[PDB]
Amino acid sequence: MEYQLTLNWPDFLERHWQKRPVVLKRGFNNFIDPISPDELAGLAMESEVDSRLVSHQDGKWQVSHGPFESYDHLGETNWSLLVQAVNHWHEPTAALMRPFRELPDWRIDDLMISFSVPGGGVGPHLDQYDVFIIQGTGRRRWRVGEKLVDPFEAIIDEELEPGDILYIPPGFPHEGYALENAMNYSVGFRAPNTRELISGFADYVLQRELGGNYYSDPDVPPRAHPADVLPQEMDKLREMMLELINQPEHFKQWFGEFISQSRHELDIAPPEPPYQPDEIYDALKQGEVLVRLGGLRVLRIGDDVYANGEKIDSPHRPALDALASNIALTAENFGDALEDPSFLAMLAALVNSGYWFFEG
Amino acid sequence: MEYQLTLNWPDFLERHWQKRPVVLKRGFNNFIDPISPDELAGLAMESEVDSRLVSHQDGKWQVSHGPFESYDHLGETNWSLLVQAVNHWHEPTAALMRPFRELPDWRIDDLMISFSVPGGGVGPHLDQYDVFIIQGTGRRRWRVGEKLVDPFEAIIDEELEPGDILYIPPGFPHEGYALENAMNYSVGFRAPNTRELISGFADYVLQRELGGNYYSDPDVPPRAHPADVLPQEMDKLREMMLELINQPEHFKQWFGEFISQSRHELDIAPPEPPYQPDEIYDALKQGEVLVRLGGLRVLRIGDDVYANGEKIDSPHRPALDALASNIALTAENFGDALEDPSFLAMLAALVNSGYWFFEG
């Protein structure tokens, strides 16, 4: 069961992406929910799952953090259950993100799911990330205001029916609540800020013991006061910093290892006993399907491939492209790379880490 | 008791600084040691003082780390006591660094002192910093080889007598040992490497919550494979990093707070009871002398002054210049800045921190 978007992509990218919110009426035709509210509540009982219950009664709000060992007496209205990274824990839910691969993988994040009884919601919110809010079963009133959380005048005020999608760029205040029992599936995106880049790269430089070159001044300039630090010296320091940043491969490597990690916990379960390369080879040749873990980020930067922060280095370009793009793999995809024991051993390592697994 | 260098500074800067080692014969005329070996050993008994005892017997070496509660049975030859930052703990020793203020304050570090019986030394060493090794009482054989620690062929091999100075640039392997009971005073310099700059600045950005601007891509480029991260996106990230670094005042401030701290512990003793501004004012007007703490780093960057990592902000330029250059201050230096209660309060704060103190 896959999903087909009806959206006009060039139009959307030109007119809306990172620009202006919009409601995509019937973005999915005959939308069938990939998960039931019962199953969603089943996920929210688990220790490793990010979930919260938001209620509101006579003005004030109430956030309870999961896991929940009970939903006994909750009420018939004005509450909502939210679960993060459901794609990490539920394959059919992970299927929802496939049609959004018109946008790059490195920018996409995870699938958030909210169930809400009538009047249920999280209240007025403003974010710094893009989001596609997919309406499942039920109906939801959504309001979005101008890019100015205090109350706002809406520029979009719509009731969402199954199949409808609400796209909201960063900065636009929005508020949604349920009219009838509703499921909302938020396909969220992520973008780093400069602070995170500079910190991550600094840590990378420190761990690898890079940038060990010292400031040198054989032409140390004269000054009126010995305590002064002249602008040109400052410029020299700055320039060696910027030059360290602009180094060709260190940057590609750091960012490759950085952007390939997930914000939320993955379902890591190493197979026991571990796979030998021969076993991988045999499984693939016999027709078995190699499946990527849900939420596992795999990105291609230059020649290398990066999966959950670790480098994947192989001369077999097509095989690595296949590994990076296909979440389900067969032997045909790898091609003659399987005859390379090195590559085979790397695949074996990745599988033993629990990043890929056969069938399920 | 001050010290007068006989060195030709333009010659030294042109021909030797960060370029080539040299022996400055009689750099100090009639050199009188600012500290006796007894006093030096007295310092090395204290908890807060960095000191080590290096011995060597029949090939192998032995490093003991201070403090030392005994020197009972040590031997008559082949050992050496080393103490770091003696200028932090001994004023007459701190006087030795004044004539080297032809080089900028921000590049200079601290005064290291070694006492050694005949045959005493630390063995062959290579450093990444500049150093002036001043020969006190006794004699020492020093050898310096080419900028290539394995043994080396020397290009300088000299016996140092009282008043002699051996300058060694970074990278030149050197080895010195005592012929008769010797005192050596190493005026050392420091230069940051790129790693330290990038880490410090990253931490500065994180603490102040700067660089909160996110990567935005309204013109998100097309790609063959959704997993790819295109060179231009990388360039955008890089560029926002470099742009954060090149921000005008944040850089000056971070570096100002960074380069003004000392590597070694300072002798911080806040006066009790704390000074009121009126008391500072009165003390200065009555003719008392305000003295900077030994090792306390004060540097001028643009308009601001930085002392031990903290910013000093005042419209009174001459007074702050005086504070930055003069280690001993009188009212005349501050001038009409003392009539400003704000400035007075700042001075009071700095004194209460233990950074400056009256007389002693």
Side-chain angles (χ1 to χ4, degrees), chain A residues 1-25 27-56 59-68 71 74-149 151-360, chain B residues 1-25 27-56 59-68 71 74-149 151-360:
Chain A
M1 183 177 67
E2 285 282 286
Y3 288 91
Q4 328 255 225
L5 250 176
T6 61
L7 181 62
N8 188 314
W9 276 104
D11 282 342
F12 174 78
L13 295 177
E14 164 137 342
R15 301 295 181 184
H16 291 284
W17 177 252
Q18 290 266 317
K19 297 181 199 63
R20 184 193 161 80
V22 72
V23 175
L24 309 183
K25 296 295 296 181
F28 291 113
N29 254 79
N30 317 84
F31 182 80
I32 289 121
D33 288 73
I35 185 174
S36 68
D38 290 339
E39 297 165 351
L40 183 65
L43 272 178
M45 296 192 301
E46 305 180 358
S47 154
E48 63 288 354
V49 165
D50 250 44
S51 57
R52 60 188 173 106
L53 260 166
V54 175
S55 295
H56 71 90
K60 64 262 253 296
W61 296 77
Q62 236 292 341
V63 170
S64 310
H65 272 91
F68 300 103
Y71 303 111
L74 240 175
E76 197 187 340
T77 60
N78 295 328
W79 68 262
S80 185
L81 170 67
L82 296 83
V83 179
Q84 307 294 321
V86 185
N87 56 310
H88 292 202
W89 309 108
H90 207 259
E91 229 156 20
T93 302
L96 267 174
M97 314 189 67
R98 287 297 315 211
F100 295 95
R101 293 188 60 162
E102 230 67 52
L103 292 160
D105 292 344
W106 79 271
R107 290 240 35 223
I108 207 170
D109 199 348
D110 291 317
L111 206 300
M112 208 214 72
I113 302 186
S114 70
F115 172 80
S116 49
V117 292
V122 294
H125 261 96
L126 196 156
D127 308 320
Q128 287 303 319
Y129 303 111
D130 302 86
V131 69
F132 290 91
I133 306 170
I134 312 169
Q135 173 64 50
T137 47
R139 263 69 184 169
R140 276 193 115 194
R141 187 198 186 187
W142 274 98
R143 294 171 56 257
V144 189
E146 295 282 11
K147 200 185 184 194
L148 66 127
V149 180
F152 58 89
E153 180 59 54
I155 59 174
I156 301 178
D157 193 335
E158 292 283 321
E159 296 176 1
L160 262 45
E161 287 166 287
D164 289 340
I165 304 176
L166 169 62
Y167 169 73
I168 308 179
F172 291 79
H174 53 286
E175 180 176 20
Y177 62 78
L179 301 184
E180 22 218 70
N181 287 10
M183 291 281 285
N184 276 190
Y185 307 82
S186 297
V187 178
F189 285 70
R190 57 192 258 184
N193 59 25
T194 311
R195 187 171 56 236
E196 292 161 12
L197 292 176
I198 218 278
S199 287
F201 180 67
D203 285 346
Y204 173 81
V205 170
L206 185 128
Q207 150 69 4
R208 299 227 181 190
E209 305 284 354
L210 308 170
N213 52 325
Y214 292 86
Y215 176 92
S216 65
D217 53 348
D219 298 313
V220 52
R223 61 209 73 214
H225 307 96
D228 290 342
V229 178
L230 300 184
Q232 63 209 250
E233 305 179 301
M234 219 85 70
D235 289 341
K236 199 174 185 302
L237 299 160
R238 245 196 328 112
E239 280 164 352
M240 73 187 60
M241 262 173 289
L242 310 173
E243 110 84 42
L244 170 61
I245 294 186
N246 291 343
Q247 284 183 359
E249 299 300 301
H250 294 165
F251 183 64
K252 292 176 55 184
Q253 285 205 355
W254 157 73
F255 184 73
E257 297 171 347
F258 159 71
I259 199 60
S260 55
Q261 340 223 16
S262 187
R263 310 197 319 179
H264 295 94
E265 190 185 359
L266 292 177
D267 189 12
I268 297 294
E272 311 283 10
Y275 280 85
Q276 301 294 326
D278 279 340
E279 203 169 331
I280 296 299
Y281 182 88
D282 291 336
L284 288 178
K285 287 296 182 179
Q286 291 164 0
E288 296 198 19
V289 180
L290 195 57
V291 180
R292 186 196 300 184
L293 183 60
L296 202 276
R297 295 169 61 81
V298 183
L299 305 161
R300 173 153 141 247
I301 292 195
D303 300 317
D304 301 281
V305 162
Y306 301 88
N308 205 27
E310 78 185 49
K311 190 152 68 71
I312 300 177
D313 205 349
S314 186
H316 306 278
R317 190 105 179 186
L320 258 49
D321 281 17
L323 259 172
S325 69
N326 296 28
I327 78 109
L329 292 146
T330 65
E332 304 84 87
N333 299 128
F334 302 105
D336 55 23
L338 295 186
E339 303 307 319
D340 188 344
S342 171
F343 176 84
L344 212 47
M346 299 184 188
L347 254 200
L350 297 161
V351 162
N352 288 334
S353 295
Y355 294 171
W356 282 262
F357 56 86
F358 289 106
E359 308 282 325
Chain B
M1 183 177 67
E2 285 282 286
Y3 288 91
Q4 328 255 225
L5 250 176
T6 61
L7 181 62
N8 188 314
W9 276 104
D11 282 342
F12 174 78
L13 295 177
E14 164 137 342
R15 301 295 181 184
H16 291 284
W17 177 252
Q18 290 266 317
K19 297 181 199 63
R20 184 193 161 80
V22 72
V23 175
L24 309 183
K25 296 295 296 181
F28 291 113
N29 254 79
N30 317 84
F31 182 80
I32 289 121
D33 288 73
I35 185 174
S36 68
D38 290 339
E39 297 165 351
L40 183 65
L43 272 178
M45 296 192 301
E46 305 180 358
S47 154
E48 63 288 354
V49 165
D50 250 44
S51 57
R52 60 188 173 106
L53 260 166
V54 175
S55 295
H56 71 90
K60 64 262 253 296
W61 296 77
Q62 236 292 341
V63 170
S64 310
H65 272 91
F68 300 103
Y71 303 111
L74 240 175
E76 197 187 340
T77 60
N78 295 328
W79 68 262
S80 185
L81 170 67
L82 296 83
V83 179
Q84 307 294 321
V86 185
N87 56 310
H88 292 202
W89 309 108
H90 207 259
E91 229 156 20
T93 302
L96 267 174
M97 314 189 67
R98 287 297 315 211
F100 295 95
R101 293 188 60 162
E102 230 67 52
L103 292 160
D105 292 344
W106 79 271
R107 290 240 35 223
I108 207 170
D109 199 348
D110 291 317
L111 206 300
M112 208 214 72
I113 302 186
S114 70
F115 172 80
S116 49
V117 292
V122 294
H125 261 96
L126 196 156
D127 308 320
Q128 287 303 319
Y129 303 111
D130 302 86
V131 69
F132 290 91
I133 306 170
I134 312 169
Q135 173 64 50
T137 47
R139 263 69 184 169
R140 276 193 115 194
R141 187 198 186 187
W142 274 98
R143 294 171 56 257
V144 189
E146 295 282 11
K147 200 185 184 194
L148 66 127
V149 180
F152 58 89
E153 180 59 54
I155 59 174
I156 301 178
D157 193 335
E158 292 283 321
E159 296 176 1
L160 262 45
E161 287 166 287
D164 289 340
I165 304 176
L166 169 62
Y167 169 73
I168 308 179
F172 291 79
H174 53 286
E175 180 176 20
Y177 62 78
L179 301 184
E180 22 218 70
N181 287 10
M183 291 281 285
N184 276 190
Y185 307 82
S186 297
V187 178
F189 285 70
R190 57 192 258 184
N193 59 25
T194 311
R195 187 171 56 236
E196 292 161 12
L197 292 176
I198 218 278
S199 287
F201 180 67
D203 285 346
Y204 173 81
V205 170
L206 185 128
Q207 150 69 4
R208 299 227 181 190
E209 305 284 354
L210 308 170
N213 52 325
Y214 292 86
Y215 176 92
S216 65
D217 53 348
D219 298 313
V220 52
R223 61 209 73 214
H225 307 96
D228 290 342
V229 178
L230 300 184
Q232 63 209 250
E233 305 179 301
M234 219 85 70
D235 289 341
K236 199 174 185 302
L237 299 160
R238 245 196 328 112
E239 280 164 352
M240 73 187 60
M241 262 173 289
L242 310 173
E243 110 84 42
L244 170 61
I245 294 186
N246 291 343
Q247 284 183 359
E249 299 300 301
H250 294 165
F251 183 64
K252 292 176 55 184
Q253 285 205 355
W254 157 73
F255 184 73
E257 297 171 347
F258 159 71
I259 199 60
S260 55
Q261 340 223 16
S262 187
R263 310 197 319 179
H264 295 94
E265 190 185 359
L266 292 177
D267 189 12
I268 297 294
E272 311 283 10
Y275 280 85
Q276 301 294 326
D278 279 340
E279 203 169 331
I280 296 299
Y281 182 88
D282 291 336
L284 288 178
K285 287 296 182 179
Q286 291 164 0
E288 296 198 19
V289 180
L290 195 57
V291 180
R292 186 196 300 184
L293 183 60
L296 202 276
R297 295 169 61 81
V298 183
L299 305 161
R300 173 153 141 247
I301 292 195
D303 300 317
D304 301 281
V305 162
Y306 301 88
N308 205 27
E310 78 185 49
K311 190 152 68 71
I312 300 177
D313 205 349
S314 186
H316 306 278
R317 190 105 179 186
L320 258 49
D321 281 17
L323 259 172
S325 69
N326 296 28
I327 78 109
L329 292 146
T330 65
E332 304 84 87
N333 299 128
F334 302 105
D336 55 23
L338 295 186
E339 303 307 319
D340 188 344
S342 171
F343 176 84
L344 212 47
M346 299 184 188
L347 254 200
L350 297 161
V351 162
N352 288 334
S353 295
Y355 294 171
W356 282 262
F357 56 86
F358 289 106
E359 308 282 325

